[PDB]
Amino acid sequence: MELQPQFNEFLANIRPTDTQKEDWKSGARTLRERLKNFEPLKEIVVSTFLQGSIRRSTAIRPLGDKRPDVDIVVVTNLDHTRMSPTDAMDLFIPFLEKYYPGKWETQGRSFGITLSYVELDLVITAIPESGAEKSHLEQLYKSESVLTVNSLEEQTDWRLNKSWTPNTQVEDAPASEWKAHPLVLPDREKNEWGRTHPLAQIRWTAEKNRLCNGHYINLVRAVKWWRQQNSEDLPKYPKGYPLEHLIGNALDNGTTSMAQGLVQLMDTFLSRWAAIYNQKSKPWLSDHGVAEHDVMARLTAEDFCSFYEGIASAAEIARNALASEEPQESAQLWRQLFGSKFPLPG
Ligand SMILES: Nc1ncnc2c1ncn2[C@@H]1O[C@H](COP(=O)(O)OP(=O)(O)OP(=O)(O)O)[C@@H](O)[C@H]1O
Ligand SMILES: Nc1ncnc2c1ncn2[C@@H]1O[C@H](COP(=O)(O)OP(=O)(O)O)[C@@H](O)[C@H]1O
Ligand SMILES: [Mg+2]
Ligand SMILES: [Mg+2]
Ligand SMILES: [Mg+2]
């Protein structure tokens, strides 16, 4: 059975809590305002915006009392050809010591800030463009479309368009205005600028979610929950954004329910990557933000193939759960995938 009400309850069980949600919204708003009024950075910071799984509504609730990772981008107007990533980061230390003493730390390519219930993960970026192109992009980064701290599932009317305003109509801006325009950020382990296009990833996710009738971001969270619940029998990677990317790739447009979507995306994953699995290899998958980047670049072939075996086992269960014509039996199969956060029907 599809058990749509039980899937809805499951999803409510695995979203970050309201306490966490309000903490990161307050945290982002307060960080943005402090940066905006901090005299040494006033003319450097273009925008401070919420990104990552929290922004895309693809984040799951941490286990126990762990704090969610909340990704934040600071957009600067620094010239990346004259300043290194660490030059840009160095500018923020007095700010962090003034407003977050004892609660921040450098974490390689980003800054970690500990709030009461969440952990902010701040990356410092720059705009590679110059002149009028730069000004047009700065206008986009300063718009409500970028500055909203609500997540995708809270604002299905959201579009990437400097003229979008919250529904207290418009479409995404023409691709020529943003598609070929990534930011640069620090590379993970070395002091060089790499490209990243979080706005394009967010827009792609919102659109995929629309194309999939609202089931895509829920399926991402459900599969992340499966991976966590079955972590002993799965490789450590993929997880996080590469896992999300594999799910968005495997899912077809037109999804009509969670249960159907799970079976379809698992079946498609297995047929699409069968040859790669037979070759003991891994796929090269273009990032939706920066086309020439392989999202799977750090994933090993061994981990991809162990993951493929895990999906192959999961798909048998999911097919049986969907096919079962009895509510209790069906729910017990779904719980074989997801654990007890997936509720039994009444
Ligand atoms: N391999 C990658 N390819 C493309 N973008 C990536 C990659 N790794 C990280 N990113 C970008 O950086 C953001 C922050 O990374 P992070 O590891 O926090 O992942 P996440 O998607 O927020 O998942 P989680 O909920 O586990 O934090 C990602 O959401 C994604 O936009
Ligand atoms: N915290 C982040 N915020 C925005 N983009 C990110 C973040 N982390 C990684 N990315 C994107 O993912 C790409 C790959 O990053 P990563 O896997 O950490 O390896 P590396 O930086 O060594 O290529 C980056 O080039 C960037 O596009
Ligand atoms: Mg994150
Ligand atoms: Mg992070
Ligand atoms: Mg697809």
Residue 293 main-chain phi, psi, to 5 deg: -85, 135
State how far the Cα of 323 lies from the Cα of 330, in Å rounded to an integer. Answer: 8
Per the CB < 8 A criterion, the answer to whether 217 and 153 are in contact is: yes
- Considering 18, 23, 65, 69, which one is annotated as catalytic? 69
State how far the Cα of 56 lies from the Cα of 216, in Å rounded to an integer. Answer: 11
Resolution of the deposited coordinates, in angstroms? 1.9
- Half-sphere exposure (Cβ direction) of 287: Cα atoms closer than 13 Å: 22
Which amino acid is located at 310 in the chain? G
State how far the Cα of 320 lies from the Cα of 26, in Å rounded to an integer. Answer: 44
- Nearest to 126, CA basis, from 73, 184, 179: 184
CATH superfamily for domain 4-338? Beta Polymerase, domain 2 (3.30.460.10)
Residue of 146, 193, 196 with the most ligand 2 atoms within 8 Å of its CB, for mutation: 196
Q: Pairing mode, if any, of strands 45-50 and 104-107? A: unpaired
Residue extents of the structural domains in the chain: 4-338
End-to-end CA distance of the chain: 14
User: By alpha-carbon position, which residue is closest to atom 23 of ligand 1?
Assistant: 240
How far does residue 82's CA lie from ligand 3's centre (Å)?
29
How far does residue 163's CA lie from ligand 5's centre (Å)?
29
State how far the Cα of 177 lies from the Cα of 155, in Å rounded to an integer. Answer: 22
- Considering 18, 90, 121, 303, which one is annotated as catalytic? 121
Q: What technique solved it?
A: X-ray
